[PDB]
Amino acid sequence: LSPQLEELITKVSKAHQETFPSLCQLGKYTTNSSADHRVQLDLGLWDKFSELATKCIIKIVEFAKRLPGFTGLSIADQITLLKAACLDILMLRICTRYTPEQDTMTFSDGLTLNRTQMHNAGFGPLTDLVFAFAGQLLPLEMDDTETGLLSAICLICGDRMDLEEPEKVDKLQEPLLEALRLYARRRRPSQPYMFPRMLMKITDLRGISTKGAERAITLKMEIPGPMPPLIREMLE
Ligand SMILES: CCCCCCCCCCCCO[C@H]1O[C@H](CO)[C@@H](O[C@H]2O[C@H](CO)[C@@H](O)[C@H](O)[C@H]2O)[C@H](O)[C@H]1O
Ligand SMILES: CC1(C)CCC(C)(C)c2cc([C@@H](O)C(=O)Nc3ccc(C(=O)O)cc3F)ccc21
């Protein structure tokens, strides 16, 4: 046991909760826009969705800055890491807000969209793949501490191209991995495959983020103007 590792778990856990409300802590509300038929793009939904996505990018940067040692990396590396992992974390976050009973996803202001509305808000051809990933995440029954640590592991990764000090990044990732294994095994000792199953979700997330970036390219041709600036930063 390590006092420092236990403090890291709570630090990351609190950083995640304070930048990402849990599904049960949100007062859900709906909209009746394009609710019953799939269309190429409902502009009203795209406008609201893109605004919510921008707000969450700011929350992810906020979360990153609260991760022990992140602000110790060069600003260039901080930006490189965020640009490389923001969409992965955006995908994990929306998928943790999936309510299977209603086949809905919920945003941080409580906006709860059904599958067709997610499709019409911009997900388009990627809609069902995103919902399937969310469905496959359910069995893991991760809690918020686990989601926060997994997110931190996705972000603090030394394999990202253009890092100035990849070894320093690798060193910062080490305790996050130790923390997640310790926490996960302690919480559910009879399910020892949970830690490796969680780590493999990172590869799935990268796949779904890759497809999300491809969808952003086509979506650009469907919207009247350019995507929100912080979203463009993430996509470059
Ligand atoms: C991957 C793409 C990201 C690449 C990095 C580029 C993004 C850099 C983002 C830094 C964000 C700017 O941060 C600065 O302005 C924000 C918006 O006015 C403020 O954000 C503030 O308001 C938001 C309301 O919209 C709240 O959700 C934030 O929790 C709150 O802190 C910050 O408190 C301030 O520090
Ligand atoms: C790049 C862009 C703008 C266009 C292409 C698609 C539609 C694939 C997409 C999909 C996502 C998705 O990860 C998501 O909805 N994250 C998400 C998670 C939580 C909140 C919140 O808590 O409010 C808001 C969100 F936005 C994010 C951005 C995009």
Curated annotation (Swiss-Prot):
The reply to whether Cell membrane figures as a keyword in the UniProt entry is no
Per UniProt, the keywords (alphabetical) are:
Cytoplasm, DNA-binding, Isopeptide bond, Metal-binding, Methylation, Nucleus, Receptor, Transcription, Transcription regulation, Ubl conjugation, Zinc, Zinc-finger
Q: Where is this cross-link: Glycyl lysine isopeptide (Lys-Gly) (interchain with G-Cter in SUMO2)?
A: 220
> Tissue-wise, where is it found?
Expressed in aortic endothelial cells (at protein level).
- The NR LBD domain extends over 4-236
What does the entry list under GO cellular component?
A: chromatin; cytoplasm; membrane; nucleoplasm; nucleus; transcription regulator complex
Any one GO biological process: positive regulation of transcription by RNA polymerase II
State the Gene Ontology terms under molecular function. Answer: chromatin binding; DNA binding; DNA-binding transcription factor activity; DNA-binding transcription factor activity, RNA polymerase II-specific; nuclear receptor activity; nuclear retinoid X receptor binding; RNA polymerase II cis-regulatory region sequence-specific DNA binding; sequence-specific double-stranded DNA binding
Asked if Magnesium is a keyword of the record, the answer is no
Report the function annotation for this chain: Receptor for retinoic acid. Retinoic acid receptors bind as heterodimers to their target response elements in response to their ligands, all-trans or 9-cis retinoic acid, and regulate gene expression in various biological processes. The RAR/RXR heterodimers bind to the retinoic acid response elements (RARE) composed of tandem 5'-AGGTCA-3' sites known as DR1-DR5. In the absence of ligand, acts mainly as an activator of gene expression due to weak binding to corepressors. Required for limb bud development.
UniProt record similarity statement: Belongs to the nuclear hormone receptor family. NR1 subfamily.
- Subunit note: Homodimer. Heterodimer with a RXR molecule. Binds DNA preferentially as a RAR/RXR heterodimer. Forms a complex with PUS1 and the SRA1 RNA in the nucleus.
Q: Domain description from the entry?
A: Composed of three domains: a modulating N-terminal domain, a DNA-binding domain and a C-terminal ligand-binding domain.
Query: What name does this protein carry?
Result: Retinoic acid receptor gamma
Q: Which gene encodes it?
A: RARG
